[PDB]
Amino acid sequence: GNSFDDWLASKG
Amino acid sequence: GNSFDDWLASKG
Amino acid sequence: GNSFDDWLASKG
Amino acid sequence: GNSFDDWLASKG
Amino acid sequence: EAGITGTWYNQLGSTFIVTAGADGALTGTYESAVGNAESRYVLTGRYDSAPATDGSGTALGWTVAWKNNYRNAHSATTWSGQYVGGAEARINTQWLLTSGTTEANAWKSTLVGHDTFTKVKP
Amino acid sequence: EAGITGTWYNQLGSTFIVTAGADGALTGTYESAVGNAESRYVLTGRYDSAPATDGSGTALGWTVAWKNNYRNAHSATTWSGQYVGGAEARINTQWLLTSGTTEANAWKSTLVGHDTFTKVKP
Amino acid sequence: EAGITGTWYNQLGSTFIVTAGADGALTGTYESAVGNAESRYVLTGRYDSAPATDGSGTALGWTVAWKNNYRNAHSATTWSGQYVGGAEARINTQWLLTSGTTEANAWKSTLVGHDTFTKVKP
Amino acid sequence: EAGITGTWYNQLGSTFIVTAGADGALTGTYESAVGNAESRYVLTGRYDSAPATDGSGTALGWTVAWKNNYRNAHSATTWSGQYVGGAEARINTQWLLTSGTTEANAWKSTLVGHDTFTKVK
């Protein structure tokens, strides 16, 4: 994983 | 207050 | 005309 | 020289 | 209703003629000046087709490459922003205009600005 | 030859899977992480299909709205930049990431940054 | 007359309390809200003390680091813009707000926006 | 130790000659090219004098108005960014260069870009 994709995932 | 100052106040 | 469109036209 | 300084010089 | 499809006007003298597809597509024509085919360009972009219901705007963006059958400025603008609904509907944007440059001149390739679009001309 | 069609990589872990059409269109898929359906998004944009011959780059831009069948971030990014050909070809961009906000929070709606895309992984 | 020295207001509820020195210096206090010591910060910047006389605006810029004896947001804003004289004088800016981050989070470090300052509260 | 005071270099051939004061001030000189009096300009700015201790960078910004005793470009640049410490220390910035324009030409007033500064050329 990576920071940018983690941000997107956290929005659902 | 206002949104920008509240953001700063929240950061503390 | 307008400034932006004049700039575009000058580039040919 | 360099591009950025040349641009400044050109403005006088 | 998405509220985006139709004709929009900025303050520079430009007109944004857009169709918002059900799939998230933005398509249409951008006019940098009125009344001349030489000032009409293709636009393409994307929007959030299922925005939040909590008072937030609708995120969107689009691109125009400044080439048509009459002109080529070797440049492209992208607008990134949000649609805000209601009786005074707006599309509020920030934009980046990049021109093709040599590597030596790349520091001067990109202009930045902002534009507000309205359904009524100023 | 335009040199743009193909797979490109940035330093955030993203993959830009692009097709450049003869008519100026950019189409394809943007991956925010590898090996996950939930990380794949539609992109659309435009490029200068007849660039200058003086050593200048090729102007281009594209948009991703961060919504697919699995996720919605209520956001969109636009990349504005230029393709630079050669043995070490790259796409150099500046970008604007806008999230939908309420009107009072619009001041914090838009992130700005830069990314260089390469034909080899970082 | 430079016309810059005095109190200016923006649409976010902030106050720019500035002195323009003969030598090009901008100094003063930036208030993110009124009537709160915790909302007052130092600013410093520079302006063109010999602008063009052809109707062009006066280029300028300043910085606030969001730290005082009460608060520290580990962040700084820079405003870059121009002063436009007349009966409805304005300072038109674009700005960059950077927060300290790790290297992996640097993509989300910087907000961008625009603000117009006026001599009468909006 | 803030780590900021000293001479820094960017890829455009510029030098950022800065002093970071105890009270959060940045002062010094910005050189758009080396070995020319006509290329030296005053800078002023601010930095976070008490940054986080969790691995985050140090927020800062500064301005140069492009006027000195030899030249005046009727323009100003602001750099906004962060200092990142260690053996390969850097100041990573994004910048806005605004020129004075008429109102009709304001759409073309402001260039945007990015520059990394390093302690070695």
Author numbering:
A (entry chain C), B (entry chain E), C (entry chain G), D (entry chain I): 1 to 12
E (entry chain F), F (entry chain B), G (entry chain D): 14 to 135
H (entry chain A): 14 to 134
Provide excerpts from the study.
All peptides bind within or near the biotin binding pocket of streptavidin formed by two surface loops [1/2 (amino acids 22–28) and 3/4 (amino acids 42–52)], and by antiparallel β-sheets involved in an extensive polar interaction network, in which residues Ser88 and Thr90 of β-strand 6 play a major role. The surface loops of streptavidin are flexible: upon biotin binding they undergo a conformational change to form a closed conformation, but to accommodate the peptide ligands, loop 3/4 is dislocated by 13–16 Å from the biotin closed form to adopt a well-defined peptide-specific structure. All eight L- and D-peptides discovered in this work bind to the same pocket of streptavidin in distinctive binding modes suggesting (1) the rich malleability of L- and D-peptides and (2) the ability of streptavidin itself to adjust the flexible loop to accommodate multiple peptides with diverse sequences and conformations.
The peptides FDEWL, LAEYH, and PAWAH were selected as representative sequences from distinct clusters, along with the abundant HPQ motif, as hotspot sequences for the next step of evolution. Instead, Asn2 forms a hydrogen bond with Ser45; the backbone NH of the C-terminal Gly12 forms a hydrogen bond with Asn85. Further, Phe4, Trp7, and Leu8 are involved in critical van der Waals interactions with Trp79 and Trp120 from a neighboring streptavidin subunit [Fig. 5(A)]. For example, the substitution plot reveals a clear preference for Asp over Glu at position 5, which can be explained by the multiple polar interactions that the short Asp5 sidechain—but not the longer Glu sidechain—can accommodate. The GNSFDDWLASKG L-peptide demonstrated irreversible binding kinetics, making it impossible to determine a Kd value [Supplementary Fig. 4(C)].
